[PDB]
């Protein structure tokens, strides 16, 4: 019954933390990538190709 949080203010609160929640997923993706040396995603980054010729 999550209706307590349905209103104008909540909508404004939600929107205020949109950039944060976004940038915080950017941190996690890149973070997961860098930590597992994601072969798939990394190949695309210009430098960082320690698996080319």
């Amino acid at each position: 019954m999550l209706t307590r949080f349905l209103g104008p203010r909540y909508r404004q609160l939600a929107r205020n933390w949109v950039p944060t929640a976004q940038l915080w997923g950017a941190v996690g993706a890149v973070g997961l990538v860098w930590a597992t040396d994601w072969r798939l995603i990394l190949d695309w980054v210009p430098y960082i190709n320690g698996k080319f010729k």
Binding site: P8, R9, Q12, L13, N16, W17, T20
Partner: protein, 446 residues
């Protein structure tokens, strides 16, 4: 039905006039039978130096003690017998001497002001008597923890600058200042282009101008050679002063961040956010149900006895923050909560709370400008600070402009990841370490 917007239009324009002195002469006429006139001088203690500090204050104590044409009693006796009220004050930037009086007594009212401001006797025997009264005033002031901590905030925030000084001075100056020290500060600072004759009530502006030209003509008949009373900007310092004393029953803390100063348009928005946080006192009715989250939490959990946000302004700088009072085991919680609120606003101000803040501020403004004295003081002071008088309507427009975004942007600009100036006094063992307070000025989520 006469609307609020419309009501603001009805407030009569403040009339401004300049003499040949450079003395500005301003008034706001109303139907009242009484009034308030006085002179606002662009003189404080930020204008003083290490050695003449307390001079303005020492002058104030002498201002009503006798003039050339009216020695000793005389003044009092003229004022008292005409049933008027003579008063004065001085801050770090301003000095004022005003008279509340029957409006039909505007002619002598002004005459008396002139004399006071121009021919202040300074009889040597008086200077001696006053020396000992001010000393006493200091023993007295030492017991108002609040007065103390605000002097300490100023002392630490603006360390090494004139603004760091107090209005009354250190004891030795009071002990050491001489008549020559005084008169030289007088002539140095009581010059027309820095004075403003202000008035509010049942007068007509022309009558004021006439008087000003009659009793004030000849003050800057000598525009000074190379005396350049210019205020050097004042450094702010993220610093902290703790006057531990477990013999006091309650602690006072005052935390602030550097403010912009009198003229910056950012004030309006800061005042809104301040209104949102507001103030509190243990005699407020309505505890748990207060709109201010800080206030409501403080009331329900007994976090304090009183708190209050504030925004002090000086030229190009100011202290912006809160001051609270509480038990020795609550200093930590109060701080947490205070700070968490500051951040909430920087990053999450919602729309309605801002309306409330704006309305509060509108109420405050209009309510504050009620009666001859409060108005007169606003005229005189504003002329000094804004150069003009900002008509209610304009403030209303400034407030209306503000909404959540403006609050977050403006709050972040001054509070976010900024260095505080902390001042402590009382049983402050639990007052958090400066690093800790510093860390509380940003959020790891944001």
């Amino acid at each position: 039905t006469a609307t609020y917007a419309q009501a603001l239009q009805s407030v009569p324009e403040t009339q401004v006039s300049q003499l040949d002195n450079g003395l500005r002469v301003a008034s706001e006429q109303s139907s009242q039978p009484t009034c308030t006139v006085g002179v606002w001088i662009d003189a404080g203690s930020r204008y003083e130096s290490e050695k003449n500090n307390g001079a303005g204050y020492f002058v104030e104590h002498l201002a009503f003690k006798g003039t050339k044409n009216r020695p000793g009693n005389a003044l009092e006796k003229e004022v008292e017998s005409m049933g008027a009220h003579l008063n004065a004050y001085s801050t770090r930037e301003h000095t004022a001497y005003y008279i509340k009086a029957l409006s039909k007594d505007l002619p002598k009212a002004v005459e008396l002001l002139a004399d006071i401001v121009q021919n202040c006797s300074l009889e040597d025997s008086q200077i001696e008597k006053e020396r000992d009264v001010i000393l006493q005033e200091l023993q007295e002031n030492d017991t108002s923890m609040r007065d103390v901590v605000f002097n300490y905030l100023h002392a630490t925030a603006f360390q090494g600058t004139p603004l760091a000084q107090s209005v009354e001075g250190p004891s030795e100056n009071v002990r050491k200042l001489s008549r020559a020290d005084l008169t030289e500060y007088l002539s140095r600072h009581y010059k027309a282009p820095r004075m403003v004759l202000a008035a509010a009530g049942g007068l007509e502006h022309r009558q004021l101008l006439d008087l000003a030209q009659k009793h004030f003509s000849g003050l800057s008949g000598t525009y000074d050679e190379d005396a350049v009373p210019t205020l050097s900007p004042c450094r702010f310092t993220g610093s902290q002063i703790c006057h531990r004393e477990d013999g006091l029953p309650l602690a006072h803390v005052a935390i602030a961040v550097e403010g912009p100063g009198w003229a910056h348009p950012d004030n309006v928005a800061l005042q809104v956010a301040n209104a949102i946080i507001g103030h509190y006192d243990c005699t407020y009715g309505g505890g748990a149900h207060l709109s201010s989250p800080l206030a409501s939490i403080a009331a329900t959990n007994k976090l304090c006895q009183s708190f209050q946000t504030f925004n002090i302004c000086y030229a190009d700088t100011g202290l912006l923050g809160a001051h609270f009072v509480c038990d020795h085991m609550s200093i930590d919680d109060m701080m947490f909560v205070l700070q968490g609120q500051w951040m909430r606003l920087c990053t999450s101000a919602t729309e309605s709370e801002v309306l409330r803040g704006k309305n509060l501020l509108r109420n405050a403004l209009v309510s504050h400008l009620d009666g001859t004295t409060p108005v007169c003081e606003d005229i005189g002071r504003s002329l000094l600070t804004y150069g003009r008088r900002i008509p209610l309507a304009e403030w209303e427009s400034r407030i209306a402009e503000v909404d959540a975004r403006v609050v977050r942007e403006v709050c972040s600009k001054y509070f976010y990841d900024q260095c505080p100036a902390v001042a402590g006094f009382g049983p402050i063992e639990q007052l958090p370490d400066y690093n800790r307070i510093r860390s509380g000025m940003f959020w790891l989520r944001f």
